[PDB]
Amino acid sequence: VRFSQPFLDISYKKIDKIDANYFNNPSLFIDLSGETRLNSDFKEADAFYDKNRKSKPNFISDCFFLTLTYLHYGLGGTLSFEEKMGSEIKALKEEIEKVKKIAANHDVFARFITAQLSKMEKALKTTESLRFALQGFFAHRSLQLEVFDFICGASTFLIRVVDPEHEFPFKQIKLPLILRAHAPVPFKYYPEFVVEGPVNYSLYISKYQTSPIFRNPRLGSFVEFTTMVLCPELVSNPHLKGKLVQLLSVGAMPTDNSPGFMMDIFEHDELVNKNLLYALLDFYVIVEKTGSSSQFYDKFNSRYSISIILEELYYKIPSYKNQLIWQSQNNADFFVRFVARMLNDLTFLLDEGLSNLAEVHNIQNELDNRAEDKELQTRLASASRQAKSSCGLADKSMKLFEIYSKDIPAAFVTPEIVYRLASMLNYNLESLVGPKCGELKVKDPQSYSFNPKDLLKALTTVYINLSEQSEFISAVAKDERSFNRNLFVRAVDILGRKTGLASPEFIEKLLNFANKAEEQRKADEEEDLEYGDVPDEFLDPLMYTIMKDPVILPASKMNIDRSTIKAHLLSDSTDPFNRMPLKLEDVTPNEELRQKILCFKKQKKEEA
Amino acid sequence: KHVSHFDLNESVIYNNVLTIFELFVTFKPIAEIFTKIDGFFADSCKPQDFERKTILGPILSLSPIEAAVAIRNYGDNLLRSKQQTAMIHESLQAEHKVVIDRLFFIVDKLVRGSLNSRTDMISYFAHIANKNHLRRADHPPFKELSSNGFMSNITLLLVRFSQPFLDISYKKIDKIDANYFNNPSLFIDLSGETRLNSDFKEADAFYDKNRKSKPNFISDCFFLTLTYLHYGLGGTLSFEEKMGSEIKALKEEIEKVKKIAANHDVFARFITAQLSKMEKALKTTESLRFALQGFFAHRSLQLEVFDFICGAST
Amino acid sequence: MSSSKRIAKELSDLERDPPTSSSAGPGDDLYHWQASIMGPADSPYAGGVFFLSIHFPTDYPFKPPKISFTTKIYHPNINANGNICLDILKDQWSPALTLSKVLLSISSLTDANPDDPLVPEIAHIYKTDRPKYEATAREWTKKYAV
Amino acid sequence: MQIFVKTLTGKTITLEVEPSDTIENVKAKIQDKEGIPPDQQRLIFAGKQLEDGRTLSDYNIQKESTLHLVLRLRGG
Amino acid sequence: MQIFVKTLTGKTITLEVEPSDTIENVKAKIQDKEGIPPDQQRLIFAGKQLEDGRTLSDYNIQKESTLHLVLRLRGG
Amino acid sequence: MQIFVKTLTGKTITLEVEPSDTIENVKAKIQDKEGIPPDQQRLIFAGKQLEDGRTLSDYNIQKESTLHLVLRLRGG
Amino acid sequence: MQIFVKTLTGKTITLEVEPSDTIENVKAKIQDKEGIPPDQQRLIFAGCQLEDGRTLSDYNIQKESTLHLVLRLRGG
Amino acid sequence: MQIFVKTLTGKTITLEVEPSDTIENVKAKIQDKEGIPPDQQRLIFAGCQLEDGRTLSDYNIQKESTLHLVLRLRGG
């Protein structure tokens, strides 16, 4: 790595010495078998090798990339083998007791087994001393400082290659630069590990007090690289962008409420603050496309990191807050989708977490039977981790809700989202104040991140902020499914148990809302009952309600209201009966039945 | 649970345990109904669980063959000469003879309890037998089969019923029916039972070809004797037949892990602990090898067994 | 706003016309149902009546309801979690498919789909070992679904 | 009030009872009207097996409801 | 009128019966739980096989009469 | 028997059949053009299902009646 | 084309695959990049297992899809 | 009919076999009598190995023939 810093000088004058065209010819010394690429396939790779069709030897460029290769395959391999050997230390402790807790009363089989476990205990002491050793020279703040210096320099090198003019570090790059061809030549064909290595090193090395990033002025240059990564065309694999955002999390993670070590850089860099929030704002949407919810380590963790960033980003730096307000007032089409996707997750986060806590209790009650096995305990560990992740995600996501409601309540009141928000809030309130959480007594809930009444406080605040919006309370008044005035009354006593969670005036405001919604709830009953009756053929076949705007389905020749067919069309563009190719333009309104419904309501007015 | 180490070492326990049965067995009204109680039969039960999951299993399982007995007797002086180990033998074989006779007294009244009593005992032995066919493989599942001490003890125990009808006067030959294998089996298994000079195809037909059945304990006991002879200590002798090879195998690595440079700080201590158990393992393998040999050299027991062989052949 | 009023009419369709081999309805929760099905006579399930746990999604009409078993079964397309390999719910889920129609498609399970081996050990047995399949299915039928 | 009881054969009988009556009373009525032994009788309502110690009002059994009767029996 | 039967491995079982029950009917009442081929029917009472064609009545079978389920017939 | 068939997007083919044929034989004139495997032989008829294994007399395929062919994505 | 797969620890090893390739065909390209014998090759997609002999196009695995390299109770 | 086979230690376990039965068909009757999984089931006849899927009549193995249960370098 020492050969790097001469061309990675802090003056940054030898950038042109290393050719970014180093991967136009095929490889000469390094291997590409299994070399996954950035945002291109082998099919384009081999053709592009030929597509140029012409080669100037130079040690420097080969050494530069061999540096990254030995970074990833090398001490990156060491940290993975040892960070492993931190958790693999506990795995070794499990496999040792797998051989020691058993009956060792054989004549020679147990003798062989003792010698076998002696090798495993030698490896165990090997792992313990690796833990007591590698961390030592990781604490060697010179070696790590040199490595991080190389990271910064290499990043400074590679960021100029995406700039069409390569004006950096002597100038800036206009952002963003803008699908399978829109990626800028030739960054896309570069090896993938050149990014995975450094990010792995940064992610793992930040678990010690003398970590290289701690109070380092050279750091932050590659943060710009991370931000520029999130033109979305730059890379293709999502699961290393997930690593990037997970890095940015700890990079902005707040012991004594100390500012995050990137907060100054996240707030004192033009190239970053200009487009960072837009970037991960867009990114929070896409990760749902990485399959559905099967197991942990899914896009939800990516959401966890992508959210706890903003969680403090709104707190400390206000310029981003003003940027967000401008965004929400200008391209709110961008913002509403983001709000909807995150609102969607909450529909089952708490349900799934309660389910998995019950599963953990079930597995715990299966064992300790005083009246596979360890695979079931690995399942218990995985389910406890899943429940902790779900609870934490719910907490962070809800905490995000209130600080945006307080600032810009006019965003949440879009018609397509307000009903959903009210439904979700009421269902969460019922799920919490209900017996499901009361009976589920988790041993040390502080461990599994289940902090119920704290979340209840945030939920209450969510109602409080927008409690003065007619459309919101009207939506809450219209939740026939899970509305009850007694839920708020129960919440009052539940918060009164541990006093100080809410103010007496907080209780007054929430009870004001609870009463104020009750009348809007009641009046709808009289509207639907006295002036609403139950005729036939006036009811939506898919909803069984009268249609204020009944429209004729061009395929099935049936009447339906616009909302029902719009909801059906958002899931698939097919008719519910004959599956004809259905579009909103092909529909036809029904005026005669609309006027007949008006006359029916007039007749109902003649009744009363 | 409390006396889980139910070996023959604690000479102040098993004598009392035997005497406990010694009083029940005496009373004829006790014997005629002692055979129908809870815990008498086993469960489909695990083959290695006939040790600790029935009535008799905890008392007649006592036999010198048990590993800890050999560890406690010959594991002290592992390189003992023939006379030194013969001392342990001549000491323990007398106790073995005492216990054999004591519990044969049990089983005699058990068979002489009642009609259902003797049928129940025959069934109880047969069930243990037919679930041990795995004993006669090259590498049987030892951890999942009845301990060969137990399967050998029952053998020369039930062999005692043979010599009355195997009298040296040879007058009770007609007592055991040679037609015992005309009907299908009643208590002993024939699944996998190879035949002499006939196939299953003729076997099943000949079962029917007679088409008729007079119960008798004696004939069932005679054949169960041979069955336990083969599946029992017949299995045991081969079971220990590889032990002598195993002793050389264990000694093969004894100097293999000592010829290395033993100059570590704590890996050296772990290596020394790896052979502190290995020398005890050698002293235990040698104990087993020099203990199985002596009771085979117990001329009285083998004399009785050979007498049974001769009588059965007659 | 729209979610509940479908469920009431789908339930009252039972009162207007009761089903043949099944039944439906909720406890007190609207979205928490408990169904019923009896093992077909021309199937090893015969002699078996099943207990069902149902939770409706945010949209019972617009989304398929996840359904779980309470009674253990021995079938290829069913695991211990009561997951149903019904191709209607995830692929051709129409909004017009009634809860009764879904119960009918469940009653179609009986006809096992081999290309969906939720439990491959049972799937291969259905592929070749139908006799022991039928024996063990009734074994577990008498064990659980009394 | 009248209700519907379904047997394993699908045979439907209307039983005129009252909500205050117990399940044991209903099974006695079934045994009187068909001779079928009550110990073999297993009543199913919305996927629920009822208890003879309990009554019809306990499980919200309204009139004209459908009850499924299961006959647990073994020829062997 | 149920009877008990025990196999070689000792699996006790019960089966309700009638005086007129044919032996093959009784055997057909066995593979329900044990899965035995009825062609290899081999039942043992009083040390005798049961004539399959006849019924239980010509045998002095009494209440809880013991049988032995030994039908190995293993040509293997 | 001329029976039309159309996929999801609206593309259709012109194929011949006979009244007493089977749906798989009708499907055998569906893999003649594209080469659609029988595993994806899905037939949709007015909110109901049409199993592949049956015949045309059971599918009541009338004269010039359009059926629905949708790619199958089985698995579960 | 190319597809993805991830282990328990989060590593995301990509690998080119072809529609014709079977599940064992792709699993043959696994021990080369991770050193895992196919005896423990366990694949889950969308929460459902995959048949050993079945081809890639048997699970509609599109371009830029996702796999999940999970492991059974084997190894160690 | 019945055939023979011997291990290394000389024991001679016989077992009935049928001309139709394959080599795996007979080897399935081996772990029952000796507890050996067919993963190591190695058969030599007249110094030549036997193909796995091949049937019994594929080596003219007559009645009262001889097999030789040998083992590979597996086990231990």
From Swiss-Prot, chain B:
Q: What does this protein do?
A: E4 ubiquitin chain-elongation enzyme specifically involved in polyubiquitin chain assembly. Binds to CDC48 and elongates mono- and diubiquitinated ERAD substrates presented by the UFD1-NPL4-CDC48/p97 (UNC) AAA ATPase complex to a chain length of 4 to 6 ubiquitin moieties. Delivers these polyubiquitinated substrates to RAD23 and DSK2, which target them to the proteasome. Has E3 ubiquitin-protein ligase activity, accepting ubiquitin from its cognate E2 ubiquitin-conjugating enzyme UBC4. Enhances ubiquitination at 'Lys-48', but not at 'Lys-29' of the Ub moiety.
User: What's written under domain?
Assistant: The U-box domain is required for the ubiquitin protein ligase activity.
Species of origin:
Saccharomyces cerevisiae (strain ATCC 204508 / S288c)
Assembly description: Interacts with CDC48. Interacts with the ubiquitin-like domain of RAD23 and DSK2. Interacts with PEX29.
Upper taxonomic lineage:
Eukaryota, Fungi, Dikarya, Ascomycota, Saccharomycotina
What is the protein name given in its UniProt record?
Answer: E4 ubiquitin-protein ligase UFD2
The record's family statement is: Belongs to the ubiquitin conjugation factor E4 family.
Remarks, anything else?
Answer: Present with 2600 molecules/cell in log phase SD medium.
Provide the protein's localization. Answer: Cytoplasm; Nucleus
From Swiss-Prot, chain C:
- Any one Gene Ontology molecular-function term assigned to this protein's record: ubiquitin binding
Pathway of action: Protein modification; protein ubiquitination
The record's keywords, sorted A to Z, are: ATP-binding, Isopeptide bond, Nucleotide-binding, Phosphoprotein, Stress response, Transferase, Ubl conjugation, Ubl conjugation pathway
Q: What induces it?
A: By heat shock and cadmium.
Q: Where is the composition biased (Basic and acidic residues)?
A: 7-18
Report which reactions are catalysed by this protein: S-ubiquitinyl-[E1 ubiquitin-activating enzyme]-L-cysteine + [E2 ubiquitin-conjugating enzyme]-L-cysteine = [E1 ubiquitin-activating enzyme]-L-cysteine + S-ubiquitinyl-[E2 ubiquitin-conjugating enzyme]-L-cysteine
The record's Gene Ontology cellular component field reads:
cytoplasm; nucleus
**Residue(s) carrying Phosphoserine:** S12
Q: What are the positions of the active site?
A: C85
The catalytic activity of this protein is classed by the Enzyme Commission as 2.3.2.23
Q: Which residues form the UBC core domain?
A: 2-146
Which SUPFAM superfamilies did the record assign? Answer: UBC-like
Q: Does the keyword ATP-binding apply?
A: yes
- What does a knockout show? Defective activation of the ribosome quality control (RQC) pathway.
Q: Indicate the cross-link positions, Glycyl lysine isopeptide (Lys-Gly) (interchain with G-Cter in ubiquitin).
A: K90
What's a BP term from Gene Ontology annotated to this protein? Answer: ubiquitin-dependent protein catabolic process via the multivesicular body sorting pathway
Q: Modified after translation how?
A: The N-terminus is blocked.
- Source domain of life is Eukaryota
Q: Where in this protein does the record put region Disordered?
A: 1-22
Q: What does this protein do?
A: E2 ubiquitin-conjugating enzyme that catalyzes the covalent attachment of ubiquitin to other proteins. Mediates the selective degradation of short-lived and abnormal proteins. Mediates ubiquitination of PEX5.
User: What is noted besides the main data?
Assistant: Present with 13500 molecules/cell in log phase SD medium.
Q: How does it assemble?
A: Interacts with TUL1.
Name the protein family.
Belongs to the ubiquitin-conjugating enzyme family.
The entry's protein name is Ubiquitin-conjugating enzyme E2 4
**What species is this protein from?**
Saccharomyces cerevisiae (strain ATCC 204508 / S288c)
The opening ranks of the lineage are: Eukaryota, Fungi, Dikarya, Ascomycota, Saccharomycotina
Curated annotation (Swiss-Prot), chains D, E, F:
Taxonomic superkingdom: Eukaryota
Outcome of mutating K63R: Abolishes HLTF-mediated polyubiquitination of PCNA
Modification note? Phosphorylated at Ser-65 by PINK1 during mitophagy. Phosphorylated ubiquitin specifically binds and activates parkin (PRKN), triggering mitophagy. Phosphorylation does not affect E1-mediated E2 charging of ubiquitin but affects discharging of E2 enzymes to form polyubiquitin chains. It also affects deubiquitination by deubiquitinase enzymes such as USP30.
Question: Which residues does the UniProt site feature Essential for function point to?
Answer: H68
> Location of the Glycyl lysine isopeptide (Gly-Lys) (interchain with K-? in acceptor proteins) covalent cross-link?
G76
User: What does changing R72K do?
Assistant: No effect on ADP-ribosylation
Site positions (Interacts with activating enzyme) are R54, R72
(Microbial infection) ADP-ribosylthreonine PTM sites in chain numbering: T66
Q: Which residues cross the membrane?
A: none
Which residues are modified to Phosphoserine?
S65
Effect annotated for changing K48R: No effect on HLTF-mediated polyubiquitination of PCNA
Task: Please list the residue ranges annotated as the Ubiquitin-like domain.
Answer: 1-76
Which residues, renumbered to this chain, carry the PTM ADP-ribosylglycine? G76
Which consequence is recorded for altering G76A?
Answer: Loss of ADP-ribosylation
Q: Tell me where the cross-link Glycyl lysine isopeptide (Lys-Gly) (interchain with G-Cter in ubiquitin) is found.
A: K6, K11, K27, K29, K33, K48, K63
Name its cellular compartments.
Cytoplasm; Nucleus
The function of this protein is:
Exists either covalently attached to another protein, or free (unanchored). When covalently bound, it is conjugated to target proteins via an isopeptide bond either as a monomer (monoubiquitin), a polymer linked via different Lys residues of the ubiquitin (polyubiquitin chains) or a linear polymer linked via the initiator Met of the ubiquitin (linear polyubiquitin chains).
Recorded protein name is Ubiquitin
The gene is RPS27A
From Swiss-Prot, chains G, H:
Q: Where is this site: Essential for function?
A: H68
Task: State where the protein is found.
Answer: Cytoplasm; Nucleus; Mitochondrion outer membrane
Modifications after synthesis and translation: Phosphorylated at Ser-65 by PINK1 during mitophagy. Phosphorylated ubiquitin specifically binds and activates parkin (PRKN), triggering mitophagy. Phosphorylation does not affect E1-mediated E2 charging of ubiquitin but affects discharging of E2 enzymes to form polyubiquitin chains. It also affects deubiquitination by deubiquitinase enzymes such as USP30.
| Ubiquitin-like domain sequence ranges | 1-76
Mark the residues carrying the PTM Phosphoserine: S65
The record lists the effect of R72A as: Impairs ubiquitination by CRL2(KLHDC3) E3 ligase complex. Impairs ubiquitination by CRL2(KLHDC3) E3 ligase complex
- Crosslink (Glycyl lysine isopeptide (Lys-Gly) (interchain with G-Cter in ubiquitin)) position: K6, K11, K27, K29, K33, C48, K63
List every position bearing (Microbial infection) ADP-ribosylthreonine: T66
Reported effect of changing S65E?
A: Phosphomimetic mutant that binds and activates PRKN
- Modified positions (ADP-ribosylglycine) are G76
What does altering G75 to R/Q do? Answer: No effect on ubiquitination by CRL2(KLHDC3) E3 ligase complex. Impairs ubiquitination by CRL2(KLHDC10) E3 ligase complex
Q: What domain of life?
A: Eukaryota
From the UniProt annotation, give the residues forming the signal peptide: none
Known outcome of mutating R42E:
Impairs ubiquitination by CRL2(KLHDC3) E3 ligase complex. Impairs ubiquitination by CRL2(KLHDC3) E3 ligase complex
Q: How does it sit in the membrane?
A: Peripheral membrane protein
Q: Where is this cross-link: Glycyl lysine isopeptide (Gly-Lys) (interchain with K-? in acceptor proteins)?
A: G76
Which residue positions hold the site described Interacts with activating enzyme?
R54, R72
Kindly provide the name given to this protein in its UniProt entry.
Ubiquitin
What organism is the protein native to?
Homo sapiens
